[PDB]
A paper describes a structure:
In T5, the tail tube is formed by the stack of 40 trimers of the TTP pb616 around the tape measure protein (TMP). Thus, T5 TTP is not an outlier in the family of TTPs, as it contains the same hexamerisation domain as other phages, T6SS and pyocin tube proteins, but results from a duplication/fusion: the unusual threefold symmetry of the tube is in fact pseudo-hexameric.
We have determined the pb6 monomer structure at 2.2 Å resolution. The C-terminal domain (residues 375–462) possesses an immunoglobulin-like (Ig-like) fold of the Big-2 family, confirming a previous sequence analysis. For pb6, formation of tubes occurs even when this domain is absent (see below), and some T5-like TTP lack it. This loop is not resolved in subdomain 1 (loop β3–β4), whereas it is stabilised by crystal contacts in subdomain 2 (loop β13–β14).
Numbering used by the authors:
A (entry chain A): 3 to 38, 67 to 470
B (entry chain B): 7 to 37, 39 to 49, 68 to 437, 441 to 460
The structure:
């Protein structure tokens, strides 16, 4: 028996001196449970919008995203935890190696009565990717204790969401009923866009609470400790020739999965388009992906299980998130490549030769160069290789040297150094040359 | 929490006939899920259960452990499982129809709540709505929503919950009664053409809504108003997601023919079969709507994500209460599902084949001579074996209401169609 009451939830980093910097209202759904270590749970939606004061992309529950991801104090202008800019609101786990993550106090106003949960830790965020309910997040955690309050700890109307912001938030839902699991083998650069109809992904901190009231002579400086950071997903896809685009894509994906288990993935809630639209993205640069029944095409769709893995034990790079009300294919690609929608990734490389010559005599040298698109790209540097032929070699600085005796076509390849995997090529043919050579 | 919910038609004299335990899935809210509106302006409950059909030990009849909710949703009369309306059953299936729902107030229930050794009850409840889940991974979940007059705490137990409630033997039977086959089929049929299609459903819901309006209480009437609420328009609708392509239906012919029929046909006889249909006895829950409006707008456009299917069941006439009906069983087959669709009961045999006969087996009717035509209807157990008579691809023959056949003036095939509603036909070719 759950009595449904008019409830308002607020989270704070403080117990006194509450203001709009350290406290925020949380727009919880009808499913909200708490009791008594105290345990709590509630849901919200990923609702990205333009903050009026800063003009930056934000979510109305950013303090929860921060507390899930970091042990430091909030700094939206930084590069870790919850952080943002005019292109997107971001979250990363690079600053999560702490016994205790950033502490929150959950204030509950219900039927003119106040209470609060003192000293909370956000253990888990489960994100829904069901096409009919995209971006629902179920938050769960614990608190040291639930305490009734005799009066208002602060003015909820002042501290809470104002009418103007509430209306903006209500129009910020990810409404496009589509999710795409983008999967890329970084060794071959083979990519696939898998439509997702069902499932969830979970960010779990595996927190262990210490049994309180166990008398210690010297106070134990933590009330709990984080466990292994786990970023996983259990999805359902509609995988076949039609859904991927062609029978060759589908056959190539089956071939790839037989020999490749590690991929760079991106789960795009709301899909990706060339015009500015809302989306929430989860990126895992090195994920273990399992699609066992790929060759079985059935009405239940196909199971896709993933486990994001860090590069090193405590790198905190298992994955990261990006949310915006105005994402595009371009800024989603930026997020996937660089970790930020605002940081331009390389999109195209045109290889050029000195004088636009397509031939080169034996023993001569030819300087190659690149025209990298877009010019706003963060890192425009390239690596140089010969991918076809043997009549020339190339320097690390793109100086092509024709062999002194060999002849033939060579394919010069420039590859982006920024993680995009973008390549550009030029064919140069080494020619014999008119030099009057003689037998000595 | 360890909450136990019971529903009853009475406030005293509780027994196993008038009271039953309800196996609620996860809490009963009391604020919730589209309940009643309140007229003459100057409370809501909600919980979920599963459709769990099983054989009752005492009667050997098919039943569900929440039959009193199905009865209260569908009827204003007292419960009578041996009847033909509301919640009713037999050895083949548990059924629900809406033929006895033309009442201001439907059958009242009292919801008793035992939670942490503390009792309370919601006095005088109306079931406004039942929303049934057709998601392949959670088939047959029902979300019930309604209103009551007030929630009242109780100082002592109103009855012994262990005697009134579900016993260990029945509980175990119920726990093995889930519709486990992850498949749903929306069977649609154009009754004019007899063209039928089995559309696989992967998601959605159907809703049975009573549109109840509660009267604002504590309103001074000189003569007491004898109702506290009134039912509105009975609405049976669904919003589904179908897997509709060349391979899902069975062939590209079927898919192309379904697109054709939808462009010119809006009204169909539909059956939503939760759990699928097979030739061996298996559990299933079926919703039938004999006169439904069906809309699949993106049938062509959609290729492989999912196709929206919206339907609205419509009665045959005013106050008929025949918008649709339900049938549940732990042992349904395609044969007894077909009986439910045709006759409203899995136990009532529908016609499956008709062989057209003559006086003997004579085909030599040459000119202006009378010949009595007859039928051999299969199965012999069919309830209604009556047939209508017509002339299909006929040159100069005449047919009456009975089986009499004659061709006048030496001018130079006969078809029997079941009255039953099955649409089964049989023919015979005559010489002339
Ligand atoms: Cl800090
Ligand atoms: Cl972090
Ligand atoms: Cl936390
Ligand atoms: Cl040249
Ligand atoms: Cl030369």
């Amino acid at each position: 028996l759950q009595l449904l009451r008019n409830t308002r939830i607020f989270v704070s980093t403080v117990k006194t001196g509450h203001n709009k910097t350290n406290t925020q209202e949380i727009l919880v759904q009808d499913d909200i449970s708490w009791g008594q270590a105290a345990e709590w749970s509630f849901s919200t939606y990923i609702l990205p919008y333009k903050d009026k004061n800063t003009s930056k992309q934000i979510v109305p529950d950013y303090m929860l995203w921060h507390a899930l991801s970091s042990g430091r104090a909030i700094n939206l202008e930084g590069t870790t935890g919850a952080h943002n800019n005019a292109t997107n609101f971001m979250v990363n786990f690079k600053d999560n190696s702490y016994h205790e993550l950033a502490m929150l106090h959950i204030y509950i106003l219900t039927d003119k009565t106040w209470s609060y949960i003192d000293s909370c830790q956000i253990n888990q965020a489960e994100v829904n990717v069901d096409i009919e309910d995209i971006g629902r997040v179920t938050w769960s955690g614990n608190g040291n204790q639930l305490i009734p309050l005799d009066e208002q700890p602060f003015d909820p109307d002042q501290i809470g969401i104002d009418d103007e912001t509430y209306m903006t938030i209500q129009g910020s839902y990810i409404k496009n009923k589509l999710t795409i699991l983008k999967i890329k083998d970084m060794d071959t650069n083979k990519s696939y866009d898998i439509p997702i109809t069902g499932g969830t992904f979970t960010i779990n901190n595996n927190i262990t609470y210490l049994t309180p009231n166990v008398m210690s002579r010297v106070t134990i400086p933590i009330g709990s400790f984080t466990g292994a950071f786990e970023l996983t997903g259990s999805l359902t896809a509609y995988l076949n020739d039609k859904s991927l685009g062609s029978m060759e894509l589908y056959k190539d994906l089956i071939k790839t999965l037989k020999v490749v288990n590690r991929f760079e993935i991106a789960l795009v809630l709301g899909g990706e388009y060339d015009d500015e639209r809302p989306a929430a993205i989860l990126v895992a640069k090195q994920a273990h992906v399992n699609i066992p029944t790929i060759e079985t095409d059935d009405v239940l769709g196909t199971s896709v299980e993933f486990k994001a893995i860090p590069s090193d034990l405590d790198a905190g790079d298992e994955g990261y998130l990006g949310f915006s009300s105005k994402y595009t294919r371009t800024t989603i690609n930026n997020l996937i490549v660089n970790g930020d929608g605002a940081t331009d990734a390389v999109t195209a490389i045109t290889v050029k030769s000195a004088g636009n010559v397509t031939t080169l005599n034996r023993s001569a040298t030819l300087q190659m160069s690149v025209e990298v698109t877009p010019s706003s790209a963060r890192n425009k540097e390239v690596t140089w290789a010969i991918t076809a032929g043997d009549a020339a070699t190339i320097n690390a600085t793109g100086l092509l040297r024709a062999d002194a005796s060999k002849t033939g076509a060579v394919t010069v390849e420039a590859t982006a150094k920024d993680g995009s995997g973008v390549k550009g090529t030029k064919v140069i043919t080494v020619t014999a040359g008119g030099e009057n050579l003689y037998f000595q």
